[PDB]
Amino acid sequence: KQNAAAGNIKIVAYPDTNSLLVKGTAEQVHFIEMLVKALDVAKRHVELS
């Protein structure tokens, strides 16, 4: 329900396919998804001489 607690979410890493499993309510899943895509970005390359 819309008033479910933040502490109920569970996250399990699954490297076999480089993916994540998330358990919660629909709105919680949605927020988690937004945070994930706010976090991962393609790192720049640097060369040092």
């Binding site: 490297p15 076999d16 396919t17 480089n18 393609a42 790192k43 390359h45």
Partner: protein, 102 residues
């Protein structure tokens, strides 16, 4: 006395792996300087060897990312005391690299 020397070595290993699966390739090999006779010097030799350790990742842009450990070189050999072999097998260094690239 005047002397000139030039040398060139190229080596290329190939390894097959699967996405997200770690893999390693390891090789060692020896070569013998054919300086020859019965009134000969002892047959000198040099040994070369390589490690690769890798983990590949597919990125949706059609890019491959790899975590890489590379070790390469040839074995330190004070025992190859000979002067007569100025035709030594070429002294490469010894090198370690670890990094990530995309």
């Amino acid at each position: 006395l005047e002397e000139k020397k030039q040398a060139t070595v190229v080596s290329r290993p190939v390894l097959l792996t699967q996405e997200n699966v770690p893999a390693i390739f390891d090789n060692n090999r020896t070569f013998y300087t054919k300086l020859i006779g019965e009134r000969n010097v002892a047959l000198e030799h040099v040994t070369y060897g390589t490690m690769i350790r890798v983990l590949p990742r597919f990125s949706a842009d059609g890019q491959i990312e790899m975590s890489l450990d590379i070790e390469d070189g040839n074995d330190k050999t004070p025992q190859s005391d000979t002067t007569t072999s100025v035709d030594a097998l070429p002294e490469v260094g010894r090198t370690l690299i670890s990094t990530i690239a995309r």
